[PDB]
């Protein structure tokens, strides 16, 4: 370790999807769990912007798979919300909490169901996602499907 | 030589970049038809609620004709724009004309804020300056005072009031009403008395605003506006902080009128300023921070995404301190502006204007502009978590670069356009033998606070969505309510939350909206929030979403060879992504 | 030619008298203080459209005339209905004739007429409209809007009205300015600055479908898709075009006054070349009208009252003739239903005809002049439709205006017009084809709201007129974002609930006490006659009359008779010469 | 007596005294019922206030809405004139048609010097107007701390 400058450069590298600087930075001991002002780790940024390889290299270097931002959202939330199927699987394989709730009681299943990611909804249920989980408003993933008028998702649930 | 350009400027206070683009910028662009000699059109909408639309015309086009045609099309589109935008004024001016001179105003007694100084310049200096012979447009570095109502959500919840009630009460009790006359025509014949009726008049002081009656409690007690808000004269806007050698400053940007003599007008301005100085209050002094080697140069300041105004100020203060000590023999003044730079506006941008001593008194190559800015840039490379760059702008604008526009041609959206840009920039880096410094001219996406209102919960509780969005907007973004009279001069009234109640996500819970039944309902009852990324500065070119890309031809390569390469790389970008050349490359 | 500045405005769902009395008269009354104005004329249509033409003295700078007109119109803008302001008013300085037509088809047939029209409107029209020298662009089609097609049965079932739908759309399709975290002025020590994002415009039919109208007392939800069908569709459905029988859209381009016709066409072609590489698959530009001539037009005018379907039948026979009888001479036919040589309406149409190369049409009988007259003769045997082919460059008998000088009104002016028309027919040795240029009165449906019954039931008259207008005329609610571009949102009754008079009674309005009241309980109706197009000349009600001198008679002689004929007209009826006769 | 109304308003002492030396009505009124004493107290012409009262001016003259010259002087901060009127017998507790006393008008404008002189001459501190407000309620509603304690 050095001071705290390499951690910020790892965040920008993972955000900009540079597999190059990311592995060079952690070879120099960059904080793999360095967080930004909103509490996003490099695993958050890589999962949000869909960089599957960076998610991989980050996780083998000990990145906290269940880190939450200042509003309770985990990297699995982001990956499920924006339809990154490959990242959702590797996160769950590495022990991501499939029933993690953010500050609003919103689960990865709620987010995946809201944007209609059927494949991800199936993967989440396979790893044990609670089908009856409710958010702060009492809504389940089934209520989300009904409101969106997505009967194929409603059939799965 | 430079082609004539007209710039449209509009303001949506408290609006994000996407809100500005989709309610103002797109609407105006769609109405820019029937204008003669238009070459191209470009615009940006940013997170400070600002949009600028620049229309560039063919060489030889009469700039007066161009401005009038643009302004007439804009005015016919005015009813299509949000009321909050119309109320700020949408200006249409000839651009591509830098200032004849910059006049700075400070107070050597240290007794005036920049808001106090700006209001003095607005009410006692600007109009006489604009009437000086040879003077065209004059821009104020600040604003006249506004009556600032700084709301307290704890007190408002205590008396079951919302910002909606505050805005309603101010419109009702700071009002100027036509009330008619006694004995007006047509009268009863034989009438002798003819007198105007005078009813409410605009309020004139913080004291009068403080006693605005919000409600009477059923036990007999009164709730006045001063019981739920702090009330002071202040600025219309707080995005920009100006300092002259560390002291608060305002001033004037003066442009030369078309067909007028430059030095004759400069002497007339100085002569007019000499007339005002006997009337200045104690401490107020005129300075000239940029007498356009050249004897002046600039220093750029850019901080990371999300960085605050206070952090930018610290870097600017370090920049000011370096020039006034390490270059005390060469530098006479540093005018530091916190809030905008070259790459756009925002709390994480700033720019410093440095004026040097007389060239005659700076002997030696080491005391010239080029050597000074090289030491400064080298010394500022130490400063962490900030990019600080010194340069002489005439020396940097002066013939090796290209100006590239990446264009969304098929409704792909901002995220997919960002990917296409990233693919092109990754490839451009693979040819360092031809292309160097290929970079976006704009800003990157930043985290934003996305708050979702739950429509079902609001309706079940009887909370109006308009009360919700007015409470959120007025408290956190501020609201122009109406006008008042400050020492005989009409000025604006703004409502906004006191700073300490609109800083962090947890502060959202401090704000309550009154339901139909009369209960106070917290924001946490009908809302949820999450972090997401979004653009702080959206760009458009010829009416389509765009991303500007600057770059240089490699040493030993021509500007045409570099452009040829860029076109080849662009030809292999995703479907629906197009390009165009602009500016120096058109 | 004397330059002309044109004002255009639209009032969705308004009749001609409503347009004239809330818009046209207001603008005319404020066109003062403008230099070199020769005369002023206007049409107010039952399509909801007004066009005011200000003609200036020869030698007038068209730039100056346009700016002076625009500035006066700006000062009158606060006097116009908000519904008209928000549609946008246009002021143009262009020729009245088309310089060229840009046609767009889909060779793969994978896009309907309405798909193509939206693509042109959303991806092509604006860049063409900004090209120097382009004075006016007509879209032969309509841009998509978000269409909310309301069902009065389901609205009544849930005790809702179009007022409730409009209020919910404005509330839930909104763009909120919400400020910033750590916004200025901030507290000391603040570390985070970020934009707050609240509601944003909806972007899809699905988002509009889940707009929440109400929560029933048991807890169930009533969504917008439960009372309406939601789909993308044109802002209006009045203009449809065809290219050689195939679905098409296009742009009719007019040359700005004083611009170079050749340079402008080349600039348009260069702009189109920039757009082609990004067209969707199958989309192709065709050029069906480029100004012997090699081109000509054919106008179709059915009697007022004719439907779009019946006009389409007449256009089909016009197209059929060029595509069969004139096979060897005609390259293409671009036909537009709902747009006419003069004005716009369900009873008018136009066809642009392009001829094969002059070298492939040898013989005098295969030139433009012989072809157009053969066509006029063939189309003269068409029943209840004026159809003739003619020419018009990118840049004649007499033109007569009958003027109401004493507030006589429309009915009395019509009678005076007919009296003069019958007198001119009794002089066939001097005058030929003396006819009105305008349209005849047609049956309209007059509905009377009973103010007493409405108040007795507690039904607000504003709720009544909003329900009536939104259902049967359509209402522009606000804007949304369709694939990144700002477009309009309209509510209107689904077609099958706004076709017949009996349908009036299927619409319910909610009273103050919460009860639903059908339109039959507070309204009565009758048929009457009214104008589909009201004309004015120099600010007074007017009726244009065309005609020509008989064979072997001079134009001045024919005009002499018209003046003597007009002098014996009823009291308060004046006249004036205009256009070619000025 | 119109010329004296004009004279008492424009502040021309010499003209004024010519008019009562010529016998002009010291109690002449314009259409709004303002005597020359009203006009002098409004624009703050002390010398004319003294001269008019010397010639028998009605010190308690009312206008059409029941306002006296003391109301005008107390309202507009004319401390010299409120003294001259009170020594000549101005009803210190005079109410206009709205129940407004000179103490109300003085307290509203923060004329603490005039408030003392009014109190000294017997001003009823507990006097209410039609809305039931006293001079103390005015001081509380305006936030005038000092004036508030002068009324206890
Ligand atoms: C506000 C100006 C100012 C204020 C106070 C002291 C100063 O020395 C200045 C300038 O010199 C500015 C410029 O020179 C501009 O470049 C300048 O003159 C200018 C212009 N007229 O176009 C700009 O576009 C600005 N540019 C983005 C950096 C910049 C001005 O913002 C300032
Ligand atoms: C150009 C700004 C500027 C430039 C250089 C140095 C400065 O100190 C400033 C300002 O402070 C400005 C403002 O504060 C504005 O109020 C300001 O920031 C502003 C805004 N952000 O919308 C305005 O609306 C402006 N208006 C006149 C009140 C005004 C700005 O024009 C200037």
Curated annotation (Swiss-Prot), chain B:
List residues in topological domain: Periplasmic: 2-292, 293-586
Q: Which UniProt keywords are given for this protein, alphabetically ordered? A: Cell inner membrane, Cell membrane, Membrane, Transmembrane, Transmembrane helix, Transport
Entry membrane topology: Multi-pass membrane protein
Species annotation: Escherichia coli (strain K12)
Q: What's the family? A: Belongs to the resistance-nodulation-cell division (RND) (TC 2.A.6) family.
Its annotated function is as follows: AcrA-AcrB-AcrZ-TolC is a drug efflux protein complex with broad substrate specificity that uses the proton motive force to export substrates. (Microbial infection) Involved in contact-dependent growth inhibition (CDI), acts downstream of BamA, the receptor for CDI. Its role in CDI is independent of the AcrA-AcrB-TolC efflux pump complex.
What induces this protein's gene, according to its Swiss-Prot or TrEMBL record?
A: Positively regulated by MarA, Rob and SoxS transcriptional regulators (at protein level).
Protein name (database record):
Multidrug efflux pump subunit AcrB
Q: What GO terms describe the biological role, i.e. biological process, of this protein?
A: alkane transport; bile acid and bile salt transport; enterobactin transport; fatty acid transport; response to antibiotic; response to toxic substance; response to xenobiotic stimulus; xenobiotic detoxification by transmembrane export across the cell outer membrane
Q: Which GO terms describe its cellular component?
A: efflux pump complex; membrane; periplasmic side of plasma membrane; plasma membrane
Phenotype caused by lack of the gene: Loss of susceptibility to contact-dependent growth inhibition (CDI); inhibiting cells still contact the target.
